[PDB]
Amino acid sequence: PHRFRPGTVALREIRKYQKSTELLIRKLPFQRLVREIAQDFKTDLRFQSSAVAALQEAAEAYLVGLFEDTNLCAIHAKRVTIMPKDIQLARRIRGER
Amino acid sequence: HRFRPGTVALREIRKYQKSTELLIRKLPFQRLVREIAQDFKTDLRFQSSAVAALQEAAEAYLVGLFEDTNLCAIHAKRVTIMPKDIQLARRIRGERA
Amino acid sequence: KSVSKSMKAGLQFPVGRITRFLKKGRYAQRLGGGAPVYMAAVLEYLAAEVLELAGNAARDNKKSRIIPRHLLLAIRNDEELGKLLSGVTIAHGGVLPNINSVLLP
Amino acid sequence: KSVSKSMKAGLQFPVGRITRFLKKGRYAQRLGGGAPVYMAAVLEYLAAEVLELAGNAARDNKKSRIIPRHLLLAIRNDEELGKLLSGVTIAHGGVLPNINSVLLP
Amino acid sequence: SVETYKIYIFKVLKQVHPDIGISSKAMGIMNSFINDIFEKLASESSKLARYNKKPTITSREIQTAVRLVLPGELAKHAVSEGTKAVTKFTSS
Amino acid sequence: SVETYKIYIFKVLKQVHPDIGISSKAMGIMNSFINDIFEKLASESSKLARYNKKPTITSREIQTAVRLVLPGELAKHAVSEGTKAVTKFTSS
Amino acid sequence: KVLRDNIQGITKPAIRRLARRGGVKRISGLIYEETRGVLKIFLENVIRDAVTYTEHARRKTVTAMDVVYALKRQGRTLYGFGG
Amino acid sequence: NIQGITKPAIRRLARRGGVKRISGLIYEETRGVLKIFLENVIRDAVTYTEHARRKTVTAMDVVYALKRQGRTLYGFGG
DNA sequence: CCAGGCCTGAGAATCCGGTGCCGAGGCCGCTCAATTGGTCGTAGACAGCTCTAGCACCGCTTAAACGCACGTACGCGCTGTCCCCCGCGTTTTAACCGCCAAGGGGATTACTCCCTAGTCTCCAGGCACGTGTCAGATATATACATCCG
DNA sequence: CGGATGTATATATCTGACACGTGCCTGGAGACTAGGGAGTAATCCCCTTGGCGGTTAAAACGCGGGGGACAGCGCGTACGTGCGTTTAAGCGGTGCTAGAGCTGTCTACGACCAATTGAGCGGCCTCGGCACCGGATTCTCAGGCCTGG
């Protein structure tokens, strides 16, 4: 049957998700994770929907920027595939611990 | 006799990491600073403390940049550092757009 | 008999409100008369530049309202604006379309 | 009868001088009575920590006088101090010795 | 009530592009941008007044704060606009 | 007559390591470090009293400024030291 | 109710989509654990600052203003939620 | 005057940075990067001096500019 | 025996006209913040004076830099392999929407008490200056490690 | 495993930087007032948390496989290393003067308070720009057949 050669769907997904402006993380799982991290600090914390939306936007933007840097490192290493060492190098150069 | 390539480099690395002395000639750095400042305001006088501060800042910045460049070179499976490594380091840090 | 300070400076942004904000922010013990006018002029200039590029993006995308996507496209397409707002995230803006050349066939 | 604020709090840093600095910086309209004491306590603790690490480095170098090299070694070897002081460069301090295994023979 | 720059941004937008509107989210982003630039300028003016031991903030302080906070071309046009506005205010 | 922290830093050094001295450059560095931490804490206290409509800066403001500025264990120990100092001041 | 092991809610397709938005063409199978750890660290930092602001405000609810202030603390200014 | 930053000086800076082997074009790249850095810092320092109604650039102005770039300097007055 | 076409099926992206919906943009009422005219106090613009230090210059010394030769370690291109993401189909599951209910805390008001700014008055801690002296940098000789021949 | 190049070391030295004594003046401390801001107690009601089910879109699982990472190997050259020569940095002794730094005046600029009024904010309502969608049209994508090589 019909079969896209690998890479074509990846490029199309890149184009689609760079054209779109919608949040790529599921809201309920993100909210649950945020509340877990919060109760790790102060018990019985309420949240606002705007606060959770702000956290989700910040997290998505941070991850996309980190993935751009990781892609740059992978291309530098003469690779198409991104690997955890690329993320580690990017974070080390940026100055994150 | 002749030392093999690398031994003198390592001894120089240890020597210049154990020291705390400026590696750039003071008068050439002063002339470079004055030349650069000539493009902002004519007839500027300087202070020796000001030129010393600029020299310290420039040396620290270049040392950090070369550390990041070495990281990139090792990532690319190399011992040699190259201009592409400096460009990648600056791109991740944010100086280069 | 009452002429607003914006009209005297030939500006749109509120000189009086900027004055009140500066005085309430406790930035200095005393505030000059031309400081609010200057700051209003700078702010309106910046807003006009951003809005002009955003409207250009909206017109290019065959629309008639400026949206966060248009604002982000303007910011990331103007070199000086992106330099000013390098570490700023625009909500509901996405990313500037960019695919590295090596990844393309 | 003139008991110093520093003696009243068991501190070395100048509570009165810190009060004057806070009030002349116009950080707020009013300054609480415990704010200068708290600031002096925190500053004295930080100075004591840095000086203790620097003196340890000086002893490890077989010297009886702290130098900027000792200060920088202490700051770069303490994790939290390095996190606090990361974009800060120290005059006449150099760098930590670090040659990676790839470079080493 | 909450105070924003919606009216003023709408006036500027109708000056530059008479036939283009704007959404609520875009207005929110623009209001945040204006507030951010206002803080980034006022804090710098305050710190320069502290550095020079000067109790007052003046058009000169804001001019040098603008030169410090904006890139080249933006600073040039902003200084021109501010000088023009201050000259007009003094004349009138 | 420039005001510095030389005497107090010397006293702290003699209280910690009595057999180790200090150089002029090292004292300059320590003075700069103390000043920088002071402005960081004070500025984050002002930008924290401003966001709660509070005209005053108190021990609570300084404590939360310390928590925001310093890393974890360092802020914990600093908070303990400040609480002890304020308690002694109130008792005396 | 105590919450446990919620980091798996950031599924493999979500990480893949974020990478695709970032321009990534091929993703290794070990990227997801590292990405989950990095996201956890970032969220811990931002939430710690947000809870510090909330606790200073004598409040039991976190606000978008608190999150925005935390993101300025990290130098990650966010437009569109106030400020 | 940029040529005053000689190849041996850049090699010494690299050694303090931990570089075991250097390529040819690294020197030109380093000169360009140093020129950009100095242009930024000197621009801010000259702005401070002009606001001070002075003609001499002071170490305090240089330190304040460096603090603006997020890279503070301890030892010259802070 | 290999390729290199056009072919040509074939899904995907684009265009287009229809319809519907809810948010942008204008109008109205009100209220509260900006404007104005006046007075009082001091911050700064301006002009002088002085003397620190910044600049220009010269000459001597020698230490770092330049140029060139030689060699070998490494960057890079190529090739083979094996494996591990990718694309696609099928099954599962819990995100999501809608609706409702409970209650808890954020916002607001009111009252009271005490904490701090302000002003004056006294006097000792802190800073600049002078001077003694010892930890360390330096010259020089030496035992010790080590990497290349 | 030798040797020369380096680091480190033991000891003299000599030294200039660090530590201590002393005088003075400026900023810190104490006392009293008064006034506004912080803490506390009530109350409202709005937003946040929590339970359900249903349809369903997205996640999870499995599998063939093909494209890419990764290791190995050989070639050429570019960089490291060493030595002779040259260039100018560094020191330091002199001279000059532009300009930092502070002082005095006096004046214009800004703070401050009361009354007024117009601009901007909340609320409301209608309509058209935009999200969605199914038929048509074109645009890249991928395997294939007979002929050119």
Three-class SS state of H6: coil
The nt closest to B14 (CA vs C1′) is J7
Out of H47, H60, H64, closest to residue E67 by CB: H47
Report the alpha-carbon distance of residue H10 to residue G80 in Å, rounded: 46
- Integer Cα distance of H13 and B62 in angstroms: 7
Q: What is the CATH number of the domain that holds F57?
A: 1.10.20.10
Q: Do G22 and A71 touch (CB under 8 A)?
A: yes
List the chains bordering chain B where 3 or more Cβ pairs fall under 8 Å.
A, C, D, H
Asked, for residue F36, whether it belongs to a domain, the answer is yes
* Residue-number span of the structural domain to which E62 is assigned: 6-91
Q: Which residues of chain E form beta strands (DSSP E)?
A: 21-22, 56-57
Q: Say if strands B80-81 and H21-22 run parallel, antiparallel, or are unpaired.
A: parallel
Judge whether residue F32 contacts strand I, using its CB and a 7 Å cut-off. Answer: no
In terms of phi and psi (left: phi > 0; alpha: psi -120 to 50; beta: otherwise), the region of F74 is alpha
Resolution of the entry in angstroms: 2.9
F22 CA to I9 C1' distance (Å)? 85
CA distances H64 to B15, B53, D86, H76, Å, are 32, 11, 17, 11
Preferred mutation among H36, H51, H53, H67 to probe E, highest tally of E CBs within 10 A:
H51
A12: tokens are 């199309």
Total domains present in chain F: 1
Nucleotide nearest to C12 (CA to C1'): J119
Cβ neighbours of E11 (radius 10 Å)? 14
> And the tokens for G58?
């004598």
- List CB contacts (< 8 A) between C83 and chain B: 97
Decide: D11 and F8 in contact? Cβ < 8 Å.
no
C103 φ/ψ angles, rounded to the nearest 5 degrees: -70, -15
d(CA E57, CA B11): 56
DSSP symbols for F60-85: HHHHHHHHHHS-HHHHHHHHHHHHHH
Q: In terms of DSSP H, where are the helices of chain C?
A: 5-9, 15-24, 35-60, 68-77, 79-84
Q: What is the CB neighbour count within 10 angstroms for residue F83?
A: 15
Residues 15 to 74 of B: which have CB under 8 A from any D CB?
17-20, 56-57, 60, 63, 70, 74
3-state helix, strand, coil in chain B (%, to 5): 65, 5, 30
What fold does the segment set H2-68 form as a domain? Histone, subunit A (1.10.20)
Fold classification of G7-73 is: Histone, subunit A (1.10.20)
CA distance A54 to G79: 9
Side chain identity, residue A47: F
- Other beta carbons within 10 angstroms of residue E90's beta carbon come to 13
* Alpha helices for chain H (secondary structure H): 7-17, 26-51, 59-68
Angle at the Cα of C10 (from C4 to C11), degrees rounded to 5?
A: 80
Please state the φ and ψ torsions of residue H34, each to the nearest 5 degrees.
-65, -40
Taking residue C51's Cβ as centre, other Cβ atoms within 10 Å add up to 25
Neighbours of B80 (CB within 10 A): 13
Closest to B30 measured CA to CA, from B46, B15, B17: B46
d(CA F63, CA F75): 9
Contact across the interface for G18 and A58, Cβ inside 8 Å: no
Query: Which of F2, F9, F31, F32 to mutate to test binding with chain H, by most H CBs within 10 Å of its CB?
Result: F32
Report the b/e string of F14-27 with b at 16+ CB within 10 A. Answer: eebbeebebeebbb
**Spatial CB neighbours of F1, under 8 Å, sequence gap ≥ 6:** none
Give the C-alpha distances (Å, rounded to integers) separating A12 from A18, C95, H42: 10, 15, 47
Domain boundaries, chain G: 7-73
**C chain contacts of residue A14, beta-carbon cutoff 8 Å:** 99, 103
Whose C1' is closest to the CA of C104: which nucleotide? J140
Judge E/A contact: 3 or more CB pairs < 8 A: no
Q: In chain A, what are the domains?
A: 24-94 (1.10.20.10)
> D92: phi > 0 → left, psi -120 to 50 → alpha, else beta; which?
left
Closest Cα partner for E31 from C75, C27, C24, C46? C46
Which whole-number Å values give the CA distances from E91 to B75, C9, C18, in the listed order? 64, 9, 21
Domains of chain C: 5-84 (1.10.20.10)
Taking a C-beta distance cutoff of 8 angstroms, is the pair C51, E16 a contact? yes
